[PDB]
Scaffold this motif. Structure first.
Motif, PDB file in Angstrom:
ATOM      1  N   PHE A  25     -12.776   8.386 -11.874  1.00  0.00           N
ATOM      2  CA  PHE A  25     -12.055   9.698 -11.454  1.00  0.00           C
ATOM      3  C   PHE A  25     -11.240  10.048 -12.615  1.00  0.00           C
ATOM      4  CE2 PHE A  25      -7.673  11.089 -10.059  1.00  0.00           C
ATOM      5  CZ  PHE A  25      -8.127  12.144  -9.574  1.00  0.00           C
ATOM      6  N   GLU A  26     -11.547  11.504 -13.208  1.00  0.00           N
ATOM      7  CA  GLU A  26     -10.959  11.884 -14.179  1.00  0.00           C
ATOM      8  C   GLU A  26     -10.015  12.924 -13.860  1.00  0.00           C
ATOM      9  OE1 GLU A  26     -14.686  13.735 -16.350  1.00  0.00           O
ATOM     10  OE2 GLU A  26     -13.932  12.360 -18.067  1.00  0.00           O
ATOM     11  N   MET A  27      -8.875  12.454 -14.468  1.00  0.00           N
ATOM     12  CA  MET A  27      -7.561  13.442 -14.499  1.00  0.00           C
ATOM     13  C   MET A  27      -6.821  13.493 -15.719  1.00  0.00           C
ATOM     14  SD  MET A  27      -4.945  11.223 -12.173  1.00  0.00           S
ATOM     15  CE  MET A  27      -4.102  13.163 -11.726  1.00  0.00           C
ATOM     16  N   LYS A  28      -6.608  15.011 -16.181  1.00  0.00           N
ATOM     17  CA  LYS A  28      -6.232  14.923 -17.534  1.00  0.00           C
ATOM     18  C   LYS A  28      -4.808  15.600 -17.334  1.00  0.00           C
ATOM     19  CE  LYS A  28      -9.930  16.493 -19.398  1.00  0.00           C
ATOM     20  NZ  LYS A  28     -10.852  16.898 -20.256  1.00  0.00           N
ATOM     21  N   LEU A  29      -3.620  14.982 -17.792  1.00  0.00           N
ATOM     22  CA  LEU A  29      -2.347  15.490 -17.465  1.00  0.00           C
ATOM     23  C   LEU A  29      -1.442  15.668 -18.590  1.00  0.00           C
ATOM     24  CD1 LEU A  29      -1.493  12.529 -15.320  1.00  0.00           C
ATOM     25  CD2 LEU A  29      -2.332  14.712 -14.318  1.00  0.00           C
ATOM     26  N   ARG A  30      -0.464  16.368 -18.497  1.00  0.00           N
ATOM     27  CA  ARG A  30       0.541  16.652 -19.805  1.00  0.00           C
ATOM     28  C   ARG A  30       1.771  16.026 -19.345  1.00  0.00           C
ATOM     29  NH1 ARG A  30      -0.129  23.094 -18.320  1.00  0.00           N
ATOM     30  NH2 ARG A  30      -0.126  21.901 -16.423  1.00  0.00           N
ATOM     31  N   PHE A  59      -3.834  11.949 -21.401  1.00  0.00           N
ATOM     32  CA  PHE A  59      -2.476  12.774 -21.600  1.00  0.00           C
ATOM     33  C   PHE A  59      -2.301  13.717 -22.764  1.00  0.00           C
ATOM     34  CE2 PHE A  59      -0.512   9.327 -18.870  1.00  0.00           C
ATOM     35  CZ  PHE A  59       0.155  10.186 -18.166  1.00  0.00           C
ATOM     36  N   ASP A  60      -2.139  14.940 -22.527  1.00  0.00           N
ATOM     37  CA  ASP A  60      -1.958  15.741 -23.738  1.00  0.00           C
ATOM     38  C   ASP A  60      -2.996  15.966 -24.583  1.00  0.00           C
ATOM     39  OD1 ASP A  60       0.884  16.822 -23.170  1.00  0.00           O
ATOM     40  OD2 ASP A  60       1.307  14.515 -23.364  1.00  0.00           O
ATOM     41  N   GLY A  61      -4.095  15.918 -23.976  1.00  0.00           N
ATOM     42  CA  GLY A  61      -5.283  16.055 -24.833  1.00  0.00           C
ATOM     43  C   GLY A  61      -5.519  14.882 -25.929  1.00  0.00           C
ATOM     44  N   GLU A  62      -4.713  13.804 -25.738  1.00  0.00           N
ATOM     45  CA  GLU A  62      -4.944  12.649 -26.689  1.00  0.00           C
ATOM     46  C   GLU A  62      -6.198  11.887 -26.290  1.00  0.00           C
ATOM     47  OE1 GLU A  62      -1.336  10.893 -25.906  1.00  0.00           O
ATOM     48  OE2 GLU A  62      -0.162  12.253 -27.038  1.00  0.00           O
ATOM     49  N   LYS A  63      -7.172  12.055 -27.289  1.00  0.00           N
ATOM     50  CA  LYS A  63      -8.693  11.342 -27.051  1.00  0.00           C
ATOM     51  C   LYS A  63      -8.524   9.851 -27.766  1.00  0.00           C
ATOM     52  CE  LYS A  63     -10.345  15.093 -25.533  1.00  0.00           C
ATOM     53  NZ  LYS A  63     -11.478  14.563 -24.675  1.00  0.00           N
TER      54      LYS A  63
END
Ligand SMILES: [Ca+2]
Length: 375
Positions: A25-30, A59-63
């Motif tokens: 389950f992919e969810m990208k947040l800020r 979080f915040d595009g942090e890969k």
């Protein structure tokens, strides 16, 4: 009967994995908008079952970060937000209480409050399904309603003691002469607010014949009546992840532990199964101060102090006698180390707290309390 540990294993065995579900389950947040981002994603999913997949949170595009630690952090940040009384959904059960209850005025704070309660329900369900803990403690009646257990006059004690004693007295005595009515007077904003416990309640007198009903109606007003839809929305969301028949193997005490990992920590047991290093003793002044401190700490702080030293918030079944370190059996340990200037440290792998020999109890209180706050 099964004890909690066996109940939990039994519980996890019945909680079957979903196969007709995306592998994750992919969810990208800020971070600045965790709440609204999580709500939109978690409430928008095609099927609630998608929230059962392995959590893939960014979080915040942090890969590049371990997805397992990011999820655990999310459960923490989202809890902070959902349970913040600033949002009007939940509120402290009382000024001197740290426990939470549904704010009866949820709708006034947020017109769309019901979907947010279903969201909080889904997240709570997610924590339990994925073997993680929420951060927050609710009033006992909150857990009882989840298990469809009756709210009792006793549940009132833990919340409002003055209200409890008044009702207890009424239970144990003939209240007739007091001329009480089927009404509740709530003081708000420097005014008294009278509410019928029932139709025409103002003209009905509490007697030995109708006092059980009276007490019942008061308990319902305090914990149930004004939050029926809020809790219903929360339960619906929760049961989309955890079938309610399953959660029913636990009681309110176990449920609380399962969801938020909170509970009353027996300081006595703790105290008696603790070892002392480098000159320390059970009678040693500093140690006496340490236990005095722990005794006056909140259930939350007692637990977090335990986390700080042990590396976990969990208390082993059968008490502290069976506390495990890193390399086997290891009783909670306190060792004299350092100078009164530096804070206490924690060697988790040995379940040991290095405690400087402070010269004042109040100083010890400060130092220790600060060292716990970073954990
Ligand atoms: Ca001793």
């Amino acid at each position: 009967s099964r004890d909690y540990k066996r109940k939990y294993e039994f519980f996890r065995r019945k909680l079957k994995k979903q196969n007709d579900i995306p592998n994750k389950f992919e969810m990208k947040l800020r971070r600045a908008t965790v709440l609204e981002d999580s709500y939109r994603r978690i409430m928008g999913v095609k099927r609630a079952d998608f929230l059962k997949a392995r959590l893939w949170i960014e979080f915040d595009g942090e890969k590049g970060l371990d997805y397992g630690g990011v999820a655990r952090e999310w459960f923490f940040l989202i809890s902070k937000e959902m349970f913040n009384p600033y949002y009007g959904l939940f509120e402290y059960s009382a000024t001197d209480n740290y426990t939470l209850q549904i704010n009866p005025n949820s709708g006034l704070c947020n017109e769309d409050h019901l979907s947010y309660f279903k969201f909080i329900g889904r997240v709570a369900g997610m924590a339990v399904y994925h073997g993680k803990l929420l951060d927050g403690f609710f009033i006992r009646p909150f857990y009882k309603m989840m298990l469809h257990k009756p709210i009792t006059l006793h549940d009132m004690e833990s919340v409002d003691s003055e209200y409890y004693n008044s009702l207890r007295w009424i239970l144990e005595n003939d209240p007739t002469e007091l001329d009480l009515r089927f009404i509740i007077d709530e003081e708000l904003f420097g005014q008294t607010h009278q509410h019928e416990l029932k139709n025409g309640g103002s003209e009905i007198v509490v007697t030995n014949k109708n006092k059980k009903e009276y007490i019942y109606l008061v308990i319902q007003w305090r914990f149930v009546n004004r939050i029926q839809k809020q809790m219903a929305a929360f339960k619906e969301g929760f049961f989309e992840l955890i079938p309610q028949d399953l959660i029913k193997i636990f009681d309110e005490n176990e449920l609380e532990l399962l969801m938020c990992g909170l509970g009353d920590v027996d300081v006595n047991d703790w105290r008696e199964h603790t070892k002392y290093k480098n000159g320390y003793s059970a009678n040693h002044q500093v140690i006496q101060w340490f236990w005095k401190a722990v005794l006056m700490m909140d259930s939350e702080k007692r637990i977090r102090l335990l986390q700080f030293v042990t590396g976990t918030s969990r208390v082993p079944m059968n008490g502290f006698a069976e506390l495990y370190g890193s390399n086997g059996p290891q009783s909670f340990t306190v060792e004299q180390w350092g100078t009164p200037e530096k804070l206490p440290r924690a060697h988790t792998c040995f379940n040991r707290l290095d405690l400087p020999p402070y010269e004042s109890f109040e100083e010890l209180w400060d130092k220790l309390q600060m060292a716990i706050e970073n954990t």
